[PDB]
Design an enzyme around this catalytic site. Structure first.
Site, PDB file in Angstrom:
ATOM      1  CG  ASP A 213      48.830  55.830  60.126  1.00  0.00           C
ATOM      2  OD1 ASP A 213      49.209  56.076  61.280  1.00  0.00           O
ATOM      3  OD2 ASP A 213      48.948  54.694  59.599  1.00  0.00           O
TER       4      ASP A 213
ATOM      5  CG  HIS B 224      51.273  59.891  59.567  1.00  0.00           C
ATOM      6  ND1 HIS B 224      51.429  58.806  60.411  1.00  0.00           N
ATOM      7  CD2 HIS B 224      50.362  60.700  60.158  1.00  0.00           C
ATOM      8  CE1 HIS B 224      50.655  58.965  61.471  1.00  0.00           C
ATOM      9  NE2 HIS B 224      49.994  60.101  61.340  1.00  0.00           N
TER      10      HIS B 224
HETATM   11  N1  NAI Z   1      44.466  55.220  60.993  1.00  0.00           N
HETATM   12  C1  NAI Z   1      44.775  55.771  62.195  1.00  0.00           C
HETATM   13  O1  NAI Z   1      44.125  56.696  62.656  1.00  0.00           O
HETATM   14  C2  NAI Z   1      45.909  55.203  63.017  1.00  0.00           C
HETATM   15  C3  NAI Z   1      46.828  54.333  62.431  1.00  0.00           C
HETATM   16  N2  NAI Z   1      47.838  53.796  63.133  1.00  0.00           N
HETATM   17  C4  NAI Z   1      48.754  52.909  62.396  1.00  0.00           C
HETATM   18  O2  NAI Z   1      48.537  51.519  62.649  1.00  0.00           O
HETATM   19  C5  NAI Z   1      49.654  50.800  62.120  1.00  0.00           C
HETATM   20  C6  NAI Z   1      50.088  49.726  63.111  1.00  0.00           C
HETATM   21  O3  NAI Z   1      50.610  50.376  64.275  1.00  0.00           O
HETATM   22  P1  NAI Z   1      51.145  49.568  65.550  1.00  0.00           P
HETATM   23  O4  NAI Z   1      50.135  48.473  65.790  1.00  0.00           O
HETATM   24  O5  NAI Z   1      51.392  50.580  66.630  1.00  0.00           O
HETATM   25  O6  NAI Z   1      52.546  49.007  65.066  1.00  0.00           O
HETATM   26  P2  NAI Z   1      53.421  47.856  65.792  1.00  0.00           P
HETATM   27  O7  NAI Z   1      54.834  48.067  65.390  1.00  0.00           O
HETATM   28  O8  NAI Z   1      53.023  47.720  67.249  1.00  0.00           O
HETATM   29  O9  NAI Z   1      52.824  46.558  65.047  1.00  0.00           O
HETATM   30  C7  NAI Z   1      53.010  46.311  63.655  1.00  0.00           C
HETATM   31  C8  NAI Z   1      53.073  44.802  63.404  1.00  0.00           C
HETATM   32  O10 NAI Z   1      53.049  44.605  61.990  1.00  0.00           O
HETATM   33  C9  NAI Z   1      53.882  43.476  61.734  1.00  0.00           C
HETATM   34  N3  NAI Z   1      54.301  43.413  60.322  1.00  0.00           N
HETATM   35  C10 NAI Z   1      55.168  44.243  59.687  1.00  0.00           C
HETATM   36  N4  NAI Z   1      55.300  43.860  58.399  1.00  0.00           N
HETATM   37  C11 NAI Z   1      54.494  42.785  58.214  1.00  0.00           C
HETATM   38  C12 NAI Z   1      54.163  41.886  57.093  1.00  0.00           C
HETATM   39  N5  NAI Z   1      54.754  42.095  55.886  1.00  0.00           N
HETATM   40  N6  NAI Z   1      53.280  40.884  57.311  1.00  0.00           N
HETATM   41  C13 NAI Z   1      52.697  40.667  58.518  1.00  0.00           C
HETATM   42  N7  NAI Z   1      52.951  41.454  59.593  1.00  0.00           N
HETATM   43  C14 NAI Z   1      53.820  42.500  59.485  1.00  0.00           C
HETATM   44  C15 NAI Z   1      55.073  43.630  62.657  1.00  0.00           C
HETATM   45  O11 NAI Z   1      55.834  42.406  62.837  1.00  0.00           O
HETATM   46  C16 NAI Z   1      54.394  44.186  63.907  1.00  0.00           C
HETATM   47  O12 NAI Z   1      54.094  43.162  64.830  1.00  0.00           O
HETATM   48  C17 NAI Z   1      50.728  51.873  61.877  1.00  0.00           C
HETATM   49  O13 NAI Z   1      50.751  52.280  60.489  1.00  0.00           O
HETATM   50  C18 NAI Z   1      50.235  53.056  62.688  1.00  0.00           C
HETATM   51  O14 NAI Z   1      50.842  54.281  62.261  1.00  0.00           O
HETATM   52  C19 NAI Z   1      48.000  54.074  64.451  1.00  0.00           C
HETATM   53  C20 NAI Z   1      47.114  54.954  65.089  1.00  0.00           C
HETATM   54  C21 NAI Z   1      46.062  55.530  64.373  1.00  0.00           C
END
Ligand code: NAI
Ligand code: NAI
Ligand code: NAI
Ligand code: NAI
Lengths: 371, 371, 371, 371
Positions: D270, D96
């Site tokens: 994150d 990260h």
């Molecule tokens: N807090 C925690 O413990 C954890 C956090 N995460 C985080 O969750 C977040 C999402 O991860 P994933 O779902 O795997 O990613 P992903 O790539 O599968 O999905 C992200 C989505 O966000 C959309 N997106 C991007 N910019 C956008 C905007 N301006 N407006 C609307 N939609 C937008 C994309 O088109 C995509 O569909 C990441 O930051 C990941 O690192 C993941 C695991 C654990």
């Protein structure tokens, strides 16, 4: 050219490699279609139906084999047909060569050009000619497994879906590909508790989404696999590495620890079987005992539902049949990389690297026979 | 009192009328439980399991029958058992008297007191002891129909669910009650196109809502019934009028018009069969030909899945068994109108009006023997 | 008459026994509505909202209690309120008397007339005023169980639904009634594997059909119950015999055999608890340890979601409130048998047979005080 | 080589970067596995379990770090570990870096070779090592959001799914990727009304098809986003641009217009958080007030369900761990473009263009350190 379709001869093989519609399209294209009298009867296609479509009905198998430039079949040549294989003829059928040194040798010794349905492969990695048969076999595995779980068949005596207040059967599917997905889907629809294992997590995600978790998914670690198998009433083996002999995933030692009267259906038997204890059975005698369980190992499962599987198969194969007939093997394979991946033998050369590796037999590059 | 459970003797009958838990509860209440050595083995309940629960294991059937004040069974007495029926004993089992003059006469001539599981009926009209067996039999009809549709079994050679691009089996269920609902649900789960008929529109409305129209419903007019049957690959007969001989709904003339290799499963065979061509078969020889179709007419379907059905049955029967043992038949039936509806014979008197009508035999009011 | 609604005083009790719409309907009918300043704030109903609907806002609880002919509450009177109970007043609230000798004595010694929400019962046997709270509590049990399964909360550290390739939580629900059905439905929606037990097979049959087998059902034998609990990550106790102290179904001995960090939510705590180890907890301190497990025993679960539960409750109670206000308790109960079943105390007489039995206290017939 | 696994030290971090099965496979391959005493206890993997698999159990973290050629972790190095980072060691963990200048500097100043789980990326654009944690975090967001909606937690006091006749919670998910889909699916399963926004319409189509419209989809225009957020009881932020700092999509100004007691769960914390008001919280103190709402911002959500997430993570990472151990970073990355995309630092060079851009720090091309 002359396109020949003999009667299938494998035990209880009721499928046929072409339908009247395919015959009509071949003839529309200037091809001569030769078909052994009786070949379509298993699939309820009369000689008269084939005749009306434009086929020449021939009395004997020997003539079909001798006269055909392109020979279309469903299953691999068996021993009694090894003498019919010839140089200068194209054979297009399921081959499963990684699972039979004897079949491979016969093809190589004959000098024939052979293309396997099951290794025809598109750029996404999919096997479009195997797929419909995997769909049939998967769905059959569930129904055949449920039947053999009945006490009257030597099984545990458990109903697939249970009834309210009483536990259902525990079904384990190894492999989340076409056959495994289809087996899981039908077993789940019969009300069984279904667990599917794979080493490909993407495939498990897909299954998880499609059934919203109703079908359980487990990464195929040694621990998960052994644990699931010991608990299972019914195990369905449905793994594949394309063109390869199946890996042996369930040991006889593991089978000795299973519940008495459990049933194991090895769909992967066509590629050698993914259970250590597997050996091919037929529809006449489909099952045998291993330890206190019942193994089911039929290498031609879709044969029992020919009204479904003949059509499923030919819907898929026909576009490839037409290109082979129109242009011949070299030009068809040159134009179609997917088709070319099914290339198996030509003039004594073995053209599949995975088959050659599994059999311990020399490999020659397909590009060499194509250029 | 002495509660006796003999080994079932009907063909391939693997169920038993009590489990260790029921034995323990009976003994806790001061009752003597007598069980024939081997009676639970079909259901994987060893003599040792029954012994540990408090049962007296006895070597012969004759002793169980002679000594029991309450005799618990799963199926109706067969010919070889007619000589064991006795005055002064309560028999509690499935009877199906409307379907057997011979069984009825034997009960009447013995003077025994008999109560039928299948006519025990709560004030909402439900048959709580038949229900779990109807659930088992319905689910089995689907799996057994699918298996017999295979070409290797003499059937049409059609896969239940089809595969993408190819038609599934056409399944017709006659009766939307417990058995028909369960048959439809499993057949639909296997991917067949299912149509269910009934004369009770309320039941069709319930099926329509539960599956949101995925299972088709047709009012059972002559036109709809005949039309659906002619189109069907598989017909499941699941109608019932409680305690009555089944109406004959599918004529042999209609069967002559069906597709060759269609399968007909007559679940209502236990009450005489709802197909004109039906006659009882056994698990050893389950099918026979009518015209170009295959009939399946097993009157003890749940026997093949005893690990499921023994428990399903005893979960339901046990509260009634306990009332009969604690208080005897007269006081139990006086206290429980539902139980009293199962009353079938007592001292040569036939106590079911529907049975008496169907057999053409004198009826005597049950209130008379309970007063 | 004067209808009074005091502020609830039980720990974290955010519900209120009336909404502005109920106040308006009471006043439309010529009734005086008195409400303690602040009573609706937990449910986001301001004093101003109640004022606009026609209520008299009063500064103290003592006045509400002194002046009300009909006193409406959500929960049973607690110790500090025992001195407010009075002869000549109708109390209409959740009582749970079978679980509290102290509360029962206070009602009896005060001579007050009390009707329990939870024993109001229609002729179909349903408890229409308990039902919406059981719906809330069931849904909360799933979400609260999932949260306490987290390692950071002392639990086993298992995610409800798992993720693809990894096992989900194993959830066991005891009781297939309103609360258990709702707990099972939400737990299943979170992707857990859910098994529901009941002694009423009809209820299991209903769950089986509604989820087409996705929620497992087991008849509640000693064997099935013990086996399911040992395997469970989360157990939800949701049994009820109407108006009775809960049966003790899960022994501390059984709890000693459970997986470390398993969670047990006793919804039936309001009636004394169906786990042997249960004792009431509050939202401030909801859990305690039994052996290596975590017990959750909150007797006012719906209090935490007052925006949902205040309305759910009052949607159900209001027609009964209006009958009691218009006609008084005697005529309302004479006219409405369902209402009359909620009758609990009157002038030192205990009017529930089940409560009287459970507490070992004299019973007096309710027909006597209504004649 | 020596593969080292220290105990995680982030707050409430119960995961571990390897399981016994992974240890066994590494040792089978000639590698030395070193593991800090206690490292697996959070995930219920005892020192004895790791010992039996072939690990060397070491007393201190300093030794693991000093001796390991490949250091495997779950989370990014924290301040107290910055001194343990060393040149000539490969670090493989979640990094990260776009969200921490301090962490990045420490890696760069140490000269260590680091590869981020979360930027390992296959040719289809998928992030196979982030995916299982996104699945966990998404499902947790729903359950954690539902819990904090309870009045007793400072939330609005609304039940996730409502009850019949009363409205459910309104849930808004921003991002329809892995985490957002999983959050939506569980929230929907709890009975909430769920709306998902994305700028990728393909992802919305996929969600629309999978739930047949039950989950609402809205193109993420300023208008739709603001409108949905103002109406929401619970907002879940789940957007990502791979390897990048999260865009700030929800302003504090917008939050000031939300309903009092709404809950916002920022999964994207994150990568810096997609709410303007976000700052990282821990499992000890997970929430804080912004205006009249409650923010939840835990950067290690899967830590609370280690029995699920340890396995989910290692099922995914292990094939990559094996290639790194067998061949070293340069050869592994050279052979595997997906692996190579995770390359983050080496000998003071920052190898991610997006990280370098977001931090305003020089970028060096990965091909340069690989050739
Ligand atoms: N807090 C925690 O413990 C954890 C956090 N995460 C985080 O969750 C977040 C999402 O991860 P994933 O779902 O795997 O990613 P992903 O790539 O599968 O999905 C992200 C989505 O966000 C959309 N997106 C991007 N910019 C956008 C905007 N301006 N407006 C609307 N939609 C937008 C994309 O088109 C995509 O569909 C990441 O930051 C990941 O690192 C993941 C695991 C654990
Ligand atoms: N007996 C018969 O009549 C018929 C047999 N088949 C056979 O069924 C088998 C499966 O076919 P498809 O489902 O079409 O293949 P597929 O390629 O769609 O699926 C195979 C799955 O097995 C998985 N797999 C491979 N190695 C594994 C391992 N070591 N552990 C766990 N999972 C593993 C793969 O990841 C893949 O998801 C093939 O041998 C095919 O030839 C197909 C039709 C009929
Ligand atoms: N063969 C076996 O081993 C077993 C057979 N059975 C039998 O299955 C049969 C069905 O039982 P359930 O489903 O429990 O009965 P049920 O009473 O639940 O349902 C019977 C349905 O048939 C309908 N029906 C009656 N007359 C009809 C007519 N003329 N046309 C169309 N529909 C008609 C009724 O309206 C009712 O909905 C019974 O004979 C039962 O004894 C049950 C268990 C096992
Ligand atoms: N803690 C709280 O805040 C709340 C607690 N409750 C309580 O939840 C409990 C359940 O209520 P409902 O679901 O509305 O009741 P219900 O009457 O709808 O269902 C109770 C079920 O338990 C079953 N049962 C009874 N004895 C049994 C036994 N020995 N073994 C197995 N099953 C048995 C019954 O057959 C019935 O299906 C009640 O005590 C109710 O007062 C309800 C609302 C809130």
């Amino acid at each position: 050219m002359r396109v020949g379709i003999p009667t299938e001869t494998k035990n209880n093989e009721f499928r046929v490699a072409i339908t009247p519609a395919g015959v009509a399209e071949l003839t529309r294209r200037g091809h001569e279609v030769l078909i052994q009298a009786g070949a379509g009867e298993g699939s309820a296609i009369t000689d008269a139906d084939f005749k009306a479509a434009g086929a020449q009905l021939v009395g004997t198998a020997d003539q079909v084999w001798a006269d055909a430039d392109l020979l279309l079949k469903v299953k691999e040549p068996i021993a009694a047909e090894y003498g019919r294989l010839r140089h200068g003829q194209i054979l297009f059928t399921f081959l499963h060569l990684a699972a039979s040194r004897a079949c491979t040798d016969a093809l190589l010794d004959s000098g024939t050009t052979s293309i396997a349905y099951e290794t025809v492969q598109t750029a996404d990695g999919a096997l479009p000619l195997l797929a419909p048969m995997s769909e049939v076999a998967g769905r059959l595995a569930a129904q055949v497994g449920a039947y053999h779980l009945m006490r009257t068949q030597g099984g545990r005596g458990v109903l697939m879906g249970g009834v309210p207040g009483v536990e259902p059967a525990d079904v384990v599917v190894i492999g989340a590909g076409t056959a495994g997905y289809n087996a899981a889907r039908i077993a789940n629809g019969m009300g069984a508790t279904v667990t599917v294992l794979d080493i490909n997590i993407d495939k498990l995600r897909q299954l998880d989404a499609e059934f919203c978790g109703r079908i359980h998914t487990r990464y195929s670690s040694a621990y998960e696999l052994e644990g699931a198998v010991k608990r299972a009433d019914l195990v369905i083996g449905a793994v594949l590495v394309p063109g390869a002999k199946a890996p042996k995933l369930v040991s006889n030692s593991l089978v000795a620890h299973m519940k008495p009267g459990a049933v194991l259906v090895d769909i992967a038997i066509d590629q050698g079987g993914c259970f250590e204890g597997s050996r091919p059975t037929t529809y006449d005698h489909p099952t045998f005992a291993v330890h206190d369980t019942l193994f089911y190992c039929v290498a031609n499962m879709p044969a029992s539902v020919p009204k479904t599987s003949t059509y499923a198969l030919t819907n898929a194969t026909m576009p490839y049949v037409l290109e082979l007939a129109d242009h011949g093997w070299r030009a068809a394979c040159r134009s179609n990389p997917a088709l070319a991946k099914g290339l198996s033998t030509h003039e004594g050369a073995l053209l599949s690297e995975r088959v050659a590796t599994d059999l311990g037999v020399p490999f020659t590059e397909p590009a060499s026979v194509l250029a």
